[PDB]
Design an enzyme around this catalytic site. Structure first.
Site, PDB file in Angstrom:
ATOM      1  N   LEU A   5       1.324  -1.087   0.356  1.00 51.58           N
ATOM      2  CA  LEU A   5      -0.292  -0.143   0.440  1.00 51.58           C
ATOM      3  C   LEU A   5       1.022   1.341   0.286  1.00 51.58           C
ATOM      4  O   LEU A   5       0.409   2.375  -0.737  1.00 51.58           O
ATOM      5  CB  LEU A   5      -0.580   0.022   1.113  1.00 51.58           C
ATOM      6  CG  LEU A   5      -2.142   0.903   0.879  1.00 51.58           C
ATOM      7  CD1 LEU A   5      -3.048   0.356   0.841  1.00 51.58           C
ATOM      8  CD2 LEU A   5      -2.818   1.098   2.539  1.00 51.58           C
ATOM      9  N   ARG A   6       1.678   1.089   1.143  1.00 47.40           N
ATOM     10  CA  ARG A   6       3.061   2.640   1.217  1.00 47.40           C
ATOM     11  C   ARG A   6       3.933   2.622  -0.335  1.00 47.40           C
ATOM     12  O   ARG A   6       4.903   3.518   0.131  1.00 47.40           O
ATOM     13  CB  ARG A   6       3.422   2.446   2.001  1.00 47.40           C
ATOM     14  CG  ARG A   6       2.214   2.608   3.645  1.00 47.40           C
ATOM     15  CD  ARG A   6       2.948   3.228   4.665  1.00 47.40           C
ATOM     16  NE  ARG A   6       1.419   2.911   5.826  1.00 47.40           N
ATOM     17  CZ  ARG A   6       1.002   3.472   6.224  1.00 47.40           C
ATOM     18  NH1 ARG A   6       0.621   4.680   5.356  1.00 47.40           N
ATOM     19  NH2 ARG A   6       0.139   3.175   7.396  1.00 47.40           N
ATOM     20  N   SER A  46      -0.291  -6.731   0.632  1.00 47.71           N
ATOM     21  CA  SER A  46      -0.904  -6.433   0.880  1.00 47.71           C
ATOM     22  C   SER A  46      -1.721  -5.893  -0.381  1.00 47.71           C
ATOM     23  O   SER A  46      -2.592  -6.677  -0.642  1.00 47.71           O
ATOM     24  CB  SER A  46      -0.826  -4.625   1.488  1.00 47.71           C
ATOM     25  OG  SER A  46      -1.321  -4.289   1.905  1.00 47.71           O
ATOM     26  N   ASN A  82     -11.255 -10.477  -0.531  1.00 46.61           N
ATOM     27  CA  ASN A  82     -12.765 -10.217  -0.907  1.00 46.61           C
ATOM     28  C   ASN A  82     -13.236  -8.947  -0.788  1.00 46.61           C
ATOM     29  O   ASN A  82     -13.892  -8.200  -0.190  1.00 46.61           O
ATOM     30  CB  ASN A  82     -13.895 -10.688  -0.009  1.00 46.61           C
ATOM     31  CG  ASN A  82     -14.918 -10.951  -0.526  1.00 46.61           C
ATOM     32  OD1 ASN A  82     -16.059 -10.813  -1.270  1.00 46.61           O
ATOM     33  ND2 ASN A  82     -15.918 -11.793   0.198  1.00 46.61           N
ATOM     34  N   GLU A 106      -5.968  -7.087  10.863  1.00 49.79           N
ATOM     35  CA  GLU A 106      -5.079  -7.939  10.361  1.00 49.79           C
ATOM     36  C   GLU A 106      -6.396  -8.844  10.961  1.00 49.79           C
ATOM     37  O   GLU A 106      -5.332 -10.509  10.015  1.00 49.79           O
ATOM     38  CB  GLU A 106      -4.198  -7.343  11.738  1.00 49.79           C
ATOM     39  CG  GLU A 106      -3.279  -6.798  11.799  1.00 49.79           C
ATOM     40  CD  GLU A 106      -3.423  -5.470  12.199  1.00 49.79           C
ATOM     41  OE1 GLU A 106      -4.835  -5.196  12.222  1.00 49.79           O
ATOM     42  OE2 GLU A 106      -2.689  -4.332  12.604  1.00 49.79           O
ATOM     43  N   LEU A 135      -8.737  -9.527   9.617  1.00 48.09           N
ATOM     44  CA  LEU A 135     -10.018  -9.843   8.503  1.00 48.09           C
ATOM     45  C   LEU A 135      -9.600  -9.845   7.557  1.00 48.09           C
ATOM     46  O   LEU A 135      -9.868 -10.820   6.896  1.00 48.09           O
ATOM     47  CB  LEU A 135     -10.935  -8.716   8.429  1.00 48.09           C
ATOM     48  CG  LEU A 135     -11.784  -8.577   7.548  1.00 48.09           C
ATOM     49  CD1 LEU A 135     -12.840  -9.478   8.061  1.00 48.09           C
ATOM     50  CD2 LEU A 135     -12.596  -7.325   7.245  1.00 48.09           C
ATOM     51  N   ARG A 177      -9.256 -14.260   8.240  1.00 45.38           N
ATOM     52  CA  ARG A 177     -10.496 -15.031   8.128  1.00 45.38           C
ATOM     53  C   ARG A 177     -11.248 -14.537   6.801  1.00 45.38           C
ATOM     54  O   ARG A 177     -11.591 -15.413   5.747  1.00 45.38           O
ATOM     55  CB  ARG A 177     -11.660 -14.008   8.381  1.00 45.38           C
ATOM     56  CG  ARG A 177     -11.476 -14.711  10.730  1.00 45.38           C
ATOM     57  CD  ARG A 177     -12.083 -13.862  10.662  1.00 45.38           C
ATOM     58  NE  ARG A 177     -12.640 -12.572  11.243  1.00 45.38           N
ATOM     59  CZ  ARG A 177     -11.402 -11.266  11.660  1.00 45.38           C
ATOM     60  NH1 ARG A 177     -10.795 -12.358  12.314  1.00 45.38           N
ATOM     61  NH2 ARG A 177     -12.106 -10.437  12.175  1.00 45.38           N
ATOM     62  N   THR A 228     -12.078 -18.398   3.917  1.00 46.15           N
ATOM     63  CA  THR A 228     -12.839 -18.163   3.299  1.00 46.15           C
ATOM     64  C   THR A 228     -12.577 -18.415   2.083  1.00 46.15           C
ATOM     65  O   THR A 228     -13.016 -19.480   1.190  1.00 46.15           O
ATOM     66  CB  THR A 228     -13.809 -16.777   3.443  1.00 46.15           C
ATOM     67  OG1 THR A 228     -14.089 -16.938   4.674  1.00 46.15           O
ATOM     68  CG2 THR A 228     -14.766 -17.465   2.889  1.00 46.15           C
ATOM     69  N   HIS A 273       1.859 -10.129   9.250  1.00 44.07           N
ATOM     70  CA  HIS A 273       1.917  -9.555   7.805  1.00 44.07           C
ATOM     71  C   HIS A 273       2.647  -8.483   7.380  1.00 44.07           C
ATOM     72  O   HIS A 273       2.612  -7.266   8.675  1.00 44.07           O
ATOM     73  CB  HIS A 273       0.310  -8.787   7.606  1.00 44.07           C
ATOM     74  CG  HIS A 273      -0.907  -9.635   7.918  1.00 44.07           C
ATOM     75  ND1 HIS A 273      -1.692 -10.264   6.913  1.00 44.07           N
ATOM     76  CD2 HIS A 273      -2.418  -9.363   9.178  1.00 44.07           C
ATOM     77  CE1 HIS A 273      -2.606 -10.580   7.843  1.00 44.07           C
ATOM     78  NE2 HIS A 273      -2.757 -10.555   8.888  1.00 44.07           N
ATOM     79  N   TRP A 305       7.249  -8.303   6.277  1.00 48.67           N
ATOM     80  CA  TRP A 305       8.114  -8.000   5.456  1.00 48.67           C
ATOM     81  C   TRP A 305       8.618  -9.656   5.666  1.00 48.67           C
ATOM     82  O   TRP A 305       9.633  -9.948   4.367  1.00 48.67           O
ATOM     83  CB  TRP A 305       8.752  -7.018   5.150  1.00 48.67           C
ATOM     84  CG  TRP A 305       8.513  -6.127   4.389  1.00 48.67           C
ATOM     85  CD1 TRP A 305       7.941  -4.189   5.106  1.00 48.67           C
ATOM     86  CD2 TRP A 305       8.178  -6.097   3.049  1.00 48.67           C
ATOM     87  NE1 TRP A 305       6.948  -3.969   3.547  1.00 48.67           N
ATOM     88  CE2 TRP A 305       7.475  -4.718   2.345  1.00 48.67           C
ATOM     89  CE3 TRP A 305       8.514  -6.627   1.948  1.00 48.67           C
ATOM     90  CZ2 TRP A 305       6.648  -4.312   1.429  1.00 48.67           C
ATOM     91  CZ3 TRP A 305       7.828  -6.202   0.665  1.00 48.67           C
ATOM     92  CH2 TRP A 305       6.687  -5.298   0.193  1.00 48.67           C
TER      93      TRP A 305
END
EC number: 2.3.1.122
Length: 282
Positions: free
Chosen positions: A40-41, A124, A152, A228, A230, A233, A237, A260, A262
């Site tokens: 993201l960054r 990410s 999702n 983190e 969600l 999970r 799924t 999560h 590096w």
């Protein structure tokens, strides 16, 4: 700083669609390549994989080239509807066009890197990107890995969380990207929704998720470590839905001690090397 003597290059690849040059870090070694997508960054100087990991060293003499595009903070490596409405972005992100057309054309013409038969590896924001690239460009990407991806993005609170994370990473606007959460673009770019494409394409997929703290995911403005958890999970799924939909070419890694971060994303990149070699080169 990493191993001395690596033949790492940096490239300026024009993007007609974005009206600017895109920097790309590159290591040769074979006609097929691992595309290492950033989080993201994403910064404009170096790709996060080179900042934080020995990826080039690890894949040196692997028989694969390594491609690290530079830039695209909060872009989801997608083609946006419009320039990000808030932070003064003066052009439209067209990163799917860049990754699937402009960049492979340049690398083929100038270096002989094959546009087909490659791997996309993301984390990410780009974990989902990698799977979406494989879903819609299967000849380009017969292999895709998602490391702590948001798999999702159209479901439930995910559009809200993604919006929060994007705003926290450079003030980017998810509405400018894929529209309101009801817009077809959210489902188009939702790996869970696109599982039947991954199954029919027989994509080789490698899916990792960590849990807990510390986190390099981004979205630090989201309270109570909700992102983190969600993320894990939804990845679980995804494994179950993939199997239920007839998927038979995936690896799903949810070690309870994994984060999560590096260091674990690199651990996974190393762990999948033999996997990628066997799939892309035999």
């Amino acid at each position: 700083f990493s191993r001395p003597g690596l033949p790492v290059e940096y490239l300026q690849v024009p993007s007609a669609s974005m009206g600017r040059d895109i920097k790309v870090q590159f290591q040769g070694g074979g006609p097929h390549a691992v595309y290492l997508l950033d989080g993201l960054r994403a910064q404009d100087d170096y790709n996060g994989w080179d900042i934080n990991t020995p990826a080039f060293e690890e894949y040196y003499q692997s028989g694969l080239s390594v491609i690290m595009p530079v830039g695209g903070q909060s872009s989801f490596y997608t083609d946006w509807y419009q320039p990000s409405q808030s932070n003064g972005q003066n052009y439209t992100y067209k990163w799917e066009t860049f990754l699937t057309r402009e960049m492979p054309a340049w690398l083929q013409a100038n270096k002989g890197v094959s546009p087909t038969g490659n791997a996309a590896v993301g984390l990410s924001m780009s974990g989902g990107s990698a799977l979406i690239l494989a879903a819609y460009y299967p000849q380009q990407f017969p292999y895709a890995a998602s490391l702590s991806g948001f798999l999702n993005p159209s479901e439930g609170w995910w559009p809200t969380l993604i919006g929060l994370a994007m705003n926290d990473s450079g003030g980017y606007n998810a509405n400018s990207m894929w529209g309101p959460s009801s817009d077809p673009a959210w489902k188009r770019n939702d790996p869970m929704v696109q599982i039947p494409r991954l199954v029919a394409n027989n994509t080789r997929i490698w899916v990792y998720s960590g849990n807990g703290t510390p986190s390099d995911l981004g979205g630090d403005n989201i309270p109570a470590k909700f992102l983190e958890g969600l993320t894990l999970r939804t990845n679980q799924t995804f494994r179950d839905t993939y199997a239920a939909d007839g998927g038979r070419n995936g690896v799903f890694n949810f070690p309870p001690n994994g984060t999560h971060s590096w260091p674990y994303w690199n651990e996974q990149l190393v762990a999948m090397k033999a996997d990628i070699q066997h799939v892309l080169n035999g």
